[PDB]
Amino acid sequence: DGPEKNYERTMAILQIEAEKAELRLKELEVRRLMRARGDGPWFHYPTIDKELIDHSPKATPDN
Amino acid sequence: MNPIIFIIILLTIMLGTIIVMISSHWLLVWIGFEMNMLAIIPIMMKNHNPRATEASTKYFLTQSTASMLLMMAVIINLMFSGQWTVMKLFNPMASMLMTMALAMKLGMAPFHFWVPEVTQGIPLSSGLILLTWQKLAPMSVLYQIFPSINLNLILTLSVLSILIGGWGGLNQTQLRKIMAYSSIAHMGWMTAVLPYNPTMTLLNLIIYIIMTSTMFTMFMANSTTTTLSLSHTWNKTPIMTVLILATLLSMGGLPPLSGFMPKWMIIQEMTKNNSIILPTFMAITALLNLYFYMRLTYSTTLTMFPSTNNMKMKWQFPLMKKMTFLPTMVVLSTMMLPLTPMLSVLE
Amino acid sequence: PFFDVQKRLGVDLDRWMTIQSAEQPHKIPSRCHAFEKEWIECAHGIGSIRAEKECKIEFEDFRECLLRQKTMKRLHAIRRQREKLIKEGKYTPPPHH
Amino acid sequence: MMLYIVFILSVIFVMGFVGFSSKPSPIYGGLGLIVSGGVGCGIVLNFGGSFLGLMVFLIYLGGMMVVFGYTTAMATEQYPEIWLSNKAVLGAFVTGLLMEFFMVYYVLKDKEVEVVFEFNGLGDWVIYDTGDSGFFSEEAMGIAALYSYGTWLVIVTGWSLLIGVVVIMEITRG
Amino acid sequence: ATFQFLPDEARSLPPPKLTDPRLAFVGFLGYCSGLIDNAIRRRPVLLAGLHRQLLYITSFVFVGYYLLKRQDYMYAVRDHDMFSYIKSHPEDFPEKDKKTYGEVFEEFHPVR
Amino acid sequence: SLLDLIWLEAILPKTISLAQMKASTLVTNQKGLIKLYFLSFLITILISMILFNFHE
Amino acid sequence: AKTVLRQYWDIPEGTECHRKTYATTSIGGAAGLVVSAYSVALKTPTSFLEGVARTGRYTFTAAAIGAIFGLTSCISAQVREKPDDPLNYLIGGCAGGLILGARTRSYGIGAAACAYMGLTAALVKMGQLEGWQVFAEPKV
Amino acid sequence: LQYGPLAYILGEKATKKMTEKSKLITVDGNICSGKSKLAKEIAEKLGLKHFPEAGIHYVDSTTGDGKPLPVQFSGNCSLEKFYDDPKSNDGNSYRLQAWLYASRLLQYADALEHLLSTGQGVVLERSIYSDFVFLEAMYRQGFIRKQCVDHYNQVKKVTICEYLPPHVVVYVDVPVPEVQSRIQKKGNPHEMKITSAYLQDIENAYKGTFLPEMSEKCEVLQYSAWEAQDAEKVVEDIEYLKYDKGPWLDQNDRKLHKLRMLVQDKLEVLNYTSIPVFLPEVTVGAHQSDQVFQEFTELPGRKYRAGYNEDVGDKWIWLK
Amino acid sequence: MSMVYMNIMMAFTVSLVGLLMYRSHLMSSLLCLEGMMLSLFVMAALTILNSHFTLASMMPIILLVFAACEAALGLSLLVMVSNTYGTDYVQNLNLLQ
């Protein structure tokens, strides 16, 4: 292969590697914030589903 | 045992595990554990000899005690939360009791003394159920309560299990006690990563089950239960010795074998959380496991021990054991590292 | 659950007993029905990490209803003082108390 | 004094447990467990659970009857041990009663006691519900719901009892 | 979705090609299992039971195809979550003012 | 000299391999008695709470 | 342990050695007692005295190791005017290893204990200087 | 459908095939006592399967083409060499005895499998239950070490426990002086070197240990030389037996299902004949072991599992 | 907490220590197991009854059902242990050391 093909093949490799390297750092920062603040899809530990509550009139008034 | 009775009992063992895994209510989880223990004892007692009786009694006493602590945790959780949902626990004393209860059920150190003895006292097929299927239910509960588990407690058990499993295997010549201590060591890795990434606990669990299932199936094929009895395999089935070698090296975590993957992934997760001293200590201590895997490969595959004259009679007869799934499990036990990114399916 | 087969298949095997704000026979309400419902509705959908922090009031009140620890401490404080005042000839209970 | 009915029963409850936890002859361990089942029924009864209380008493009476039979066959020696006959049994028995007494003394001396965790000693009546005028037992409606609401619970319990018969026969067929 | 191997939203992703290198490896693993099966049972390894050998390959590829599809989907989900979170929290991902090496300073360590 | 004695006797493969043998024997030389194993379960729980506060 | 460990780190390094030595001696004794409980539980003594005599050796051996570690580590820093020096714990660690060898009647253990305990202690001092976590909080 | 739990679940239970002609008969007696001739007659008259006594090549006859294999594939154990030099240094005496026991154990399994699978009774000439008589005579004559006797007991202790003893034990009781005469008439040169003491040790082992034990759990019939001549008399006794003792009365379907599962898997049967107890007599090193094993697989129709050898005319291998 | 809980919790602890500290008779330890269920039953019942959570009133009953299975399972093993050694002593169960 000529120097030009390998040269610009190298650039295409460097771009892909640089893009992945950035996303790897971004993910570690997103995971850090999501876990600390619990305001994202990840680390979303379940709460009790409110559709299980009964809202009918009960046998007594105060409840 | 009537074959139909064995199947129904065997289906009940699975039913209890499935009930634990699909239950959203602490009572049904406890019921699932009781159903599982009820159905497994008759499998342990299947051959009705004093050793099997001892193993079943030691197993029953351990599992019963864990169920009491587990139910105690559930009732304490009920006092301090008024609900039964399977999820984080609302009382730290309840978290400790449940964590310890599950640790005994798994056989984690220092609640490990029963695993070597129960495994040695029961047939190989029963030992396979004990060291593989019986891990699913307790692990699945740990996978749901981990947000409330005390970090020091869970990591203390993991470190102790890896050490005690590593040292315990060095002195064993019985294959069932080697698998027991190997199991204790591997359980440590699963719970060590649990606080950080529960997915890697599932990955380690599945890969441990595939590799443990393969080893037990190969022991059953030639009806070997001791190191020396296994040392005759080269003189009947040469192919089997080669599969034992590859599977044992994989269990030791040697690249490029499948067994390296869970250790590789767990180290990644722990370092991402700036946990450096612990994965380094864990990886080095796992070299104890490799050492007593390498002895078995020496006496099994890489050398040839003396035979006996009567061995010539076995040359004329073929293997007739089922060896169910053995060709598939051994390939999965060894040639899966190139497919590591498939672990995201567990997410 | 580990495997949420109940949600997938739509069957309801054990969710009915999980909470005391769920439908009870003849609509008999639990003592802490209102406190549970408030906490369950506060924390719904936001996750435990957020709920531990943004629903402390609802949970703290619910815990008080369940175990009544603050109330019993208050009563022991009142009862203890009356013993001090009764024993010192300082206060005298009215006829109805 | 009568307001402390539930506490007094709970004191006898623990004493029964010290009775069989000290582990004398299972003949006397069974006796200790029968007593604890009795005052345990009394405790639950005083909280409005007459059915729950009477049943735990009934179940444990049949269980200890089987235990008594098994003791004479498989857990008997020439000189069955009473609480006074053994130093280890007496030492455990004495230790448990002294640990019970002191907990009682402080909680009564102060109306609160700290034994690892804070306990209020105002009497157990203070937590009871004030209002009540339904024309039924709440425990009965809850227990009776096992057959309408608890379809899944009946299946797993029924199966386990059926398997229990199959299992015990396998285990005991040497 | 809850407890679903492939949620419906996964159909917006391009399915794995039938010539995927990862799928070819899975098919190869089935071939090896087929050969081991002949070996342990002591049949001619390459020749025996070609009907059995074809089922080892076919079943591995069948299961592998769906595993690769779920694998791909879970990684698409991870990116979808990550990018939306970055969108939802601009203050936590601020653009760096990028100096050039002409402006930035680096201490020089001679290799003498 | 004595300094190299520490740098050797401590790091010898014999030293490493022979300490693993002691630890192995301590771990595995048990009596197989239900009584002793459960007595140790009691000690593990007590020191877990009293000493490490795992229940706190 | 949490509170006892805190007080050791609470007081400045190289100063108040009597208090430092009290901390390490307490850490030494607790470790010996824990070993004594497991030892007697799993390897039953023949008589009640030998059970006490076995508790006596292990607890004293462990307390001596800690007391010598705390004393040597504190005094070494005090002499050398270098509080936050990892080397001070290296000397404390070896002295402890020597106590184990002296208490054990075996030059093989004393040397090996010196090296491993010497390196371990220096890593501990490095650990809190640099902030290394052994049980790290989940963060990502 | 190969027999297994599924076949049993579908109605292949032993009780459906047994009768009062489903018996396991063993014919015993000293050397040259007329066992084999009597054994054939009993089987012919009762319609039972006759099993010729298990020799060095019994396992050969049940596998492959049925022909004897070269003796290197049996450790070179030699009956003639035993009679010429019973004290040879290479351990031929015990190596033969250990091989013979495993041959009888294999034959006993084959007989039980035939009995259970088809319901037809069988007739054997000696068995694992009476093989020890030669072990006892060999040791009493100093032909084997005490270590060899202990080895034999270990293998027998973990193998003979899993089987049921014969229904009927026929014993032809011939006095020793008569045997020494009959051996002379027979013409076998090696066999003529058997000493009277050896034969009196076999008779002592039989009459003193074997028959008393078999009495407690089997129908033991004994006969003189002249009674043994007419098999019709012997058959008449067998056909009018009671069968009121022994473990065969306590067997049921699930127990015989377990027994059949064992005897049909020959490697499971032979499992403990090769326990790793390194006696010099029966131990073999890797270089000899490896060299003979490679030779074994080169034998015709022996490299692959039966049915997969093209060099002996097996077809459709790519579909099997 | 309420004062009854002090003795019920103490009762569970006493039986737990009872189970963990063995003597000779294996039957004695099986009683300490039934003791733990009895205290668990009682303490669950108090919580459920006091809080007026109706649907869990069946929970203590289900607790007894699976305690009976454990006791029946434990007694079955004691039968086979006794049939082997002639006693229920636990020191005889040490073959697997």
Ligand SMILES: CCCCCCCCCCCCCCCCCC(=O)OC[C@H](COP(=O)(O)OCCN)OC(=O)CCCCCCCCCCCCCCCCC
């Ligand atoms: C690609 C990504 C994945 C990368 C991971 C690594 C992939 C490799 C994983 C291997 C998985 C196990 C399958 C190995 C197949 C081995 C086949 C073989 O070696 O031949 C078997 C041969 C049989 O001998 P024979 O009597 O002639 O035939 C009887 C069977 N019909 O047996 C013998 O006769 C040999 C007896 C002597 C024993 C020699 C032992 C040293 C040589 C072992 C080589 C295999 C090493 C495998 C270990 C893993 C290596 C990475």
Ligand SMILES: CCCCCCCCCCCCCCCCCC(=O)OC[C@H](COP(=O)(O)OCCN)OC(=O)CCCCCCCCCCCCCCCCC
């Ligand atoms: C495993 C092959 C190497 C054999 C030597 C063993 C080395 C040790 C293995 C340890 C783990 C390291 C694995 C390194 C390979 C994985 C890295 C990788 O290549 O990922 C990308 C790969 C697709 O490769 P790509 O760059 O996109 O080029 C496509 C050209 N058609 O996507 C993949 O993940 C596919 C990886 C599977 C292997 C390549 C499959 C080639 C396709 C034909 C099927 C394989 C049949 C030949 C089996 C060879 C076994 C030795």
Ligand SMILES: CCCCCCCCCCCCCCCCCC(=O)OC[C@H](COP(=O)(O)OCCN)OC(=O)CCCCCCCCCCCCCCCCC
């Ligand atoms: C592209 C392939 C690259 C392979 C990379 C290997 C990576 C490691 C994979 C590990 C798994 C290894 C397979 C499992 C072991 C099975 C082989 C074995 O057990 O022993 C070797 C065996 C020969 O033993 P034998 O008893 O003689 O069997 C009869 C075969 N004629 O069987 C053998 O003869 C050797 C088997 C291995 C050779 C595979 C050959 C590839 C398929 C060729 C297609 C068939 C060509 C037919 C040619 C004849 C027609 C012209």
Ligand SMILES: CCCCCCCCCCCCCCCCCC(=O)OC[C@H](COP(=O)(O)OCCN)OC(=O)CCCCCCCCCCCCCCCCC
């Ligand atoms: C993680 C990424 C990697 C993914 C890996 C995927 C793993 C899962 C894939 C399944 C692995 C097992 C594949 C088994 C292939 C061999 C099956 C075969 O050829 O059987 C031949 C014959 C029975 O075939 P037959 O039952 O008639 O087929 C219809 C099935 N209902 O009878 C025989 O002689 C077969 C005996 C050898 C087989 C071992 C014993 C198992 C028995 C299996 C029963 C049939 C299973 C059908 C497989 C279908 C799978 C889709």
Ligand SMILES: CCCCCCCCCCCCO[C@@H]1O[C@H](CO)[C@@H](O[C@H]2O[C@H](CO)[C@@H](O)[C@H](O)[C@H]2O)[C@H](O)[C@H]1O
């Ligand atoms: C292995 C032996 C097992 C024996 C089990 C014995 C019974 C165990 C009782 C468990 C419940 C004890 O409960 C323990 O004490 C009181 C209970 O109000 C709490 O007390 C503390 O926590 C709560 C938290 O809001 C607050 O009141 C405050 O922080 C503090 O008072 C503890 O946080 C709790 O952990």
Ligand SMILES: CCCCCCCCCCCCO[C@@H]1O[C@H](CO)[C@@H](O[C@H]2O[C@H](CO)[C@@H](O)[C@H](O)[C@H]2O)[C@H](O)[C@H]1O
């Ligand atoms: C830096 C980390 C390196 C990690 C390396 C992995 C650790 C693996 C540990 C394996 C240790 C077990 O291996 C064991 O060691 C002891 C050392 O006394 C050997 O012991 C050998 O020498 C001793 C005396 O010196 C003899 O009493 C013994 O008869 C002899 O076998 C054993 O033969 C060996 O089986």
Ligand SMILES: Nc1nc2c(ncn2[C@@H]2O[C@H](COP(=O)(O)OP(=O)(O)OP(=O)(O)O)[C@@H](O)[C@H]2O)c(=O)[nH]1
């Ligand atoms: N050492 C030894 N020799 C045996 C054994 N079984 C047979 N033999 C020998 O093999 C030869 C044949 O055995 P026999 O059947 O008893 O002799 P026989 O000539 O056939 O006399 P018959 O009873 O009439 O058949 C004899 O030389 C036996 O000594 C054995 O278990 N051990």
Ligand SMILES: [Mg+2]
């Ligand atoms: Mg003959």
